[PDB]
Amino acid sequence: HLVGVCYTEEEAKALAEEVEVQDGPNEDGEMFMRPGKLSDYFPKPYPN
Amino acid sequence: TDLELHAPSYPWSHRGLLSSLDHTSIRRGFQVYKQVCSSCHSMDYVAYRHLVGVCYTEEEAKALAEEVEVQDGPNEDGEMFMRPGKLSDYFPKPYPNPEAARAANNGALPPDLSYIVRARHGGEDYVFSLLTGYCEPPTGVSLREGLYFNPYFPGQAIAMAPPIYNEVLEFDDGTPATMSQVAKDVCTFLRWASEPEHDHRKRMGLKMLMMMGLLLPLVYAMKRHKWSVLKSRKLAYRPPK
Amino acid sequence: REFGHLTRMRHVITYSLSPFEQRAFPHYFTKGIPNVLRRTRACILRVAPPFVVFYLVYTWGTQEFEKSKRK
Amino acid sequence: DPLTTVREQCEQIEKCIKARERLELCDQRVSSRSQTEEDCTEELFDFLHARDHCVAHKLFNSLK
Amino acid sequence: LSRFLGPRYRELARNWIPTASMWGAVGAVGLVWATDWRLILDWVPYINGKF
Amino acid sequence: AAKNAVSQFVSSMSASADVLAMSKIEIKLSDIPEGKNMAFKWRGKPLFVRHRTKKEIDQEAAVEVSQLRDPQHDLERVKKPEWVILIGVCTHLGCVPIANAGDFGGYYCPCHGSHYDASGRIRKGPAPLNLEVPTYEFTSDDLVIVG
Amino acid sequence: AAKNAVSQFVSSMSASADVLAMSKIEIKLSDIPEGKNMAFKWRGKPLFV
Amino acid sequence: AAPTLTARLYSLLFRRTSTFALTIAVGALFFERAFDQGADAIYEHINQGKLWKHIKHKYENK
Amino acid sequence: TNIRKSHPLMKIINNAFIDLPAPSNISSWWNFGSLLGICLILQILTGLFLAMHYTSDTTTAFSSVTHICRDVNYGWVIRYLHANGASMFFICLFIHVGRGLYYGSYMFLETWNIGVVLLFTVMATAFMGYVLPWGQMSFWGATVITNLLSAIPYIGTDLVEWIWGGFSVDKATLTRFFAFHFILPFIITALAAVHLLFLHETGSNNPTGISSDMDKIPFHPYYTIKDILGALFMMLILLILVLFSPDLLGDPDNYTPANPLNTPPHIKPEWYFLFAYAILRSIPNKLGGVLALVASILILILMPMLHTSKQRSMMFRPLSQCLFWMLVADLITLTWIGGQPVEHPFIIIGQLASILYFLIILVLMPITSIIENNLLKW
Amino acid sequence: IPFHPYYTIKDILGALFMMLILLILVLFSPDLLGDPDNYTPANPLNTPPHIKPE
């Protein structure tokens, strides 16, 4: 929601990559980490 | 080139117009699902709380969910908690989150079995003729290394190894578990699976057939009362001569 | 179009009886089946032979599809 | 084994004596030459359809 | 039939036709602003259609 | 009452989207091992992205145009021949098969014994056309923009 | 026969199967170590401990 | 004379143009456990020993 | 001071249903017009319950339908009422059209023309609702239709892009099939009240075609009780199918969820679209199929202009009704062919009977009405 | 007097004056009439300072 408001799309794809999030399950393993993919709501400060 | 084989019609105990499903045959049919399949197949539309009043008592089916422990969601003090199963438990998946179960199954995904009887031309009549009509490939017919010659499959080459033989398990009531007894039980469990309202609708279709034997003769006699004025009348034409 | 405005009629008389002076079923099966057998002999020579032409195409149309898959 | 006692005598009908009698009359003909694509699936379908009906009328009373 | 043709209806069709055309070209150019016909907004380039 | 009542209210359910960055600007990962291709999420059906890795070459130009129903070859649509993406539609029905089944290296359509190829042409009938086109402009280094 | 459309109508919108199996009773004993109290974010109306 | 010589219930019941529409409301009773006969008697007669309340006594008492 | 004749609301009811002059010899075929109004109110009430639990999303839609059949109270009886209460709508609709064609009722021109509009809006509403369960017949029936809708040369390719939501098949794809399916039954209702405002100008036709202003009876009590008897006989046969065989008319392949990665063995619509599907596949072109589709429903408007007989009804016309049942026995042949594979015998029969449907209405009917005039000495 | 043209044109003038004042509130102050406390999600574990209808 910031592209066109505060930053260009680069400066925002690269700003999502500052933090790595937990995405869903998978084969060939589990709980795999992933950086921001721009479809990412702002990270939670607490688990619960 | 080859053709289609059609399953013969069996005299089931629920193929009558006011008939039911034999509930002890559904009890023995869940065990054959528990222990022969459910390692290659699933059932994500049927829970454990749906068999209370059908096969098992609520005490009997509470202790039957306990056998498997299912991962639940995140919390404090941990990330993925482990707890035993409750009655709010859909039957757990055999290859969970399976990108390619074919890795375990030679390039073929085994289907969900929640609607396998409602989604086949021949119903549970097709599933019984599938499991008890296996053969070995005939002359001129080739084969892949993980394919078997089933005559009741459309391509006649199925990637499922024959899952039932004589005494794959033993029942908790002493019936002799031969190949046909275990098959009939999972075609009476797999009809209740895809059609759980089967018995409730054949009795509700009796509480209206005895109400149209009352109501329908009694509006027809209101009709013949009014129309008898017109049905009996006489007409005459008397012009001046 | 109300009742005393529909047409013009002269010299016709009508006699009618009460619903309470009549039995419910005067002639039910002594007159019922010779009346239905009259209406069946009339309109079955117009209705039925179109539908036996569908039948001879259906029985021939699944005797060619089953020899289309064999020898 | 309620199958294989029902299955056995159900191929002693004089309708299954016709449907399998030509199965090895065509079974001996495919592997004669090394390059032919004639399968034997069809005279197996005539035999299985003629056998599985007679099994269906006689099997469900022996069980449960 | 013979109810329909003559020297009357087709000279009533003579001053009809301009009416027909401007009943037809009304339907032609009027359809294109309601249903977003992008293949005919190109032909007159003066009208900025979508921003 | 026309240019502001009717000319406005198509864009909620039109080619104007719901999410800003969906697949058109989303750059794609190597979540695809070469050998088989499995399903996706948007653009409707699985737009099967391809890493031939020096494969599919020659297979393309071995059979020529004569009995081939549709003149549409991968010499011009895709720019360099280690690159294609597919469509999940058909020309008559809407058919794609379970991936990597066939004799030549193509598709096993079990509806009417039809047979399709990997990069989208047809041996059989009754397919009138060949499988249609996705919209793309490949520009940058590794970032995949289809849309 | 005239109730058969409408006597099945009032008992229709009281909820069916996902509700009275668990909102009947939820056993939640042996939860807490002593000295501090928790909150149960269930029971419809809330319930404490 | 010889025909039914009983009472006449058209000088009270049904005759009312109102009752034509009131026997959705005033004529809406009397016949629910008179038809818990038949319905719950011939359903549980053809279904002998197959329902759950015909077999639950085995797994009732331990 | 009769309150049935002077009250502002009650006058309209009294003029339309109570004191209306009706012919005395009206038979059972005039009952199916009130059965269509029974079937329409039933589909609207049952459809509003099913809309409270449905979710339009191509990932979560096959699962929303199984949720009502296995979790929601009475959801199995309300869902199978709806799927079977649309087969009853379509069997009453084809008897109703064949009545008005037989007894010459199309001569009420303003009534007949609104009827042909009602036959389009009904056939389009039952299409948008069958795609909504989102199984293997709901996907491969919508992509057969939209291929024949992107063959219109000037509007066709940008129109199918709007109904799919701008994409192929995603969440905002079934949002437009669901919105038009909610709305069009409330337009069928308003077109049926205008339908009966034009019949009130002449009153009804009667099996003899001859006018009947000497022999009228009031509508109440004679046809208010005869219609009620026919409406209860309809609810008997309807509830037989909901409670004894609710899967008799549908298809099993719509119980497999929608997935383009697999393919069904056949493409088969419901029984009441099979005559219109045997005509699309009979013309080997995507333009001569979408034109031969709409010509099969639009040909009803030429029926007032093609009538060349001196009499109105077919009761006294024995050669004209011999051709009425060749037309009924040809819509049966087009319903059997419409659910067969496209093979050798099922295409020579599919096109020799898509021709005969148009040769009977347009050519063979107006010539046989003239031979009848010539044998009666006009 | 007849209703058309005298009150078919006088009502149209009043209906366009209504859509002016309505679209002023949608596009210049769309939260003037509501309440902020309905932007806190429903939770009985907390309590609002006041109860206020529209």
Ligand code: HEC
């Ligand atoms: C160890 C493997 C394995 C076991 C055990 C197994 N299955 Fe399957 N099943 C498969 C595979 C693989 C397929 C898919 C076959 C194919 O698609 O070629 C399959 C598919 C099916 C089908 C669909 C067939 C069709 O025509 O679509 C039915 C029905 C079925 N299984 C029933 C059963 C029953 C009943 C049991 C046990 C009582 C069972 N399966 C146990 C592997 C298994």
Ligand code: HEM
């Ligand atoms: C939603 C659909 C429809 C509804 C609710 C409806 C309703 C009715 C009703 C209530 C009547 C009066 C009773 C009767 O005569 O049966 C009637 C008559 C009639 N309808 Fe329909 N109808 C519908 C569709 C159609 C169609 C599709 C046609 C023809 C193409 C049609 C043509 C006629 C005609 C011609 C009559 C008068 C017949 C006569 O009096 O002889 N209607 N309709």
Ligand code: HEM
């Ligand atoms: C007027 C005539 C109508 C017809 C002929 C019709 C037809 C259909 C059909 C054939 C289906 C497919 C059912 C299935 O295959 O399971 C369906 C589904 C559905 N319809 Fe209707 N419908 C009508 C009216 C309505 C109305 C008025 C509404 C909403 C208010 C509605 C809402 C729905 C919904 C929500 C579904 C969801 C899918 C399902 O439950 O199967 N329908 N309709």
Ligand SMILES: Cc1cccc(-n2nnn(C)c2=O)c1COc1ccn(-c2ccc(Cl)cc2)n1
């Ligand atoms: C309005 C109108 C106008 C012109 C003709 C006719 N009509 N239709 N058939 N006949 C012989 C006619 O005179 C009608 C009546 O329309 C119908 C059809 C059924 N009902 C009905 C039945 C029972 C009850 Cl309770 C209420 C209504 N009304």
Ligand SMILES: Cc1cccc(-n2nnn(C)c2=O)c1COc1ccn(-c2ccc(Cl)cc2)n1
């Ligand atoms: C091809 C195919 C396959 C499977 C299901 C279905 N289908 N879709 N809906 N229903 C109930 C189905 O059976 C179909 C569509 O079949 C047809 C044929 C002609 N129409 C049609 C005619 C007029 C209008 Cl206006 C709209 C559509 N639809």
Ligand SMILES: Cc1cccc(-n2nnn(C)c2=O)c1COc1ccn(-c2ccc(Cl)cc2)n1
């Ligand atoms: C108490 C409280 C607090 C917050 C919001 C709301 N409320 N609920 N809806 N809206 C718009 C609100 O402002 C209320 C309800 O306030 C009232 C007062 C009387 N009625 C009433 C009168 C007639 C009828 Cl028939 C129905 C209701 N409602």
Ligand code: FES
């Ligand atoms: S892919 Fe379906 S027949 Fe060609």
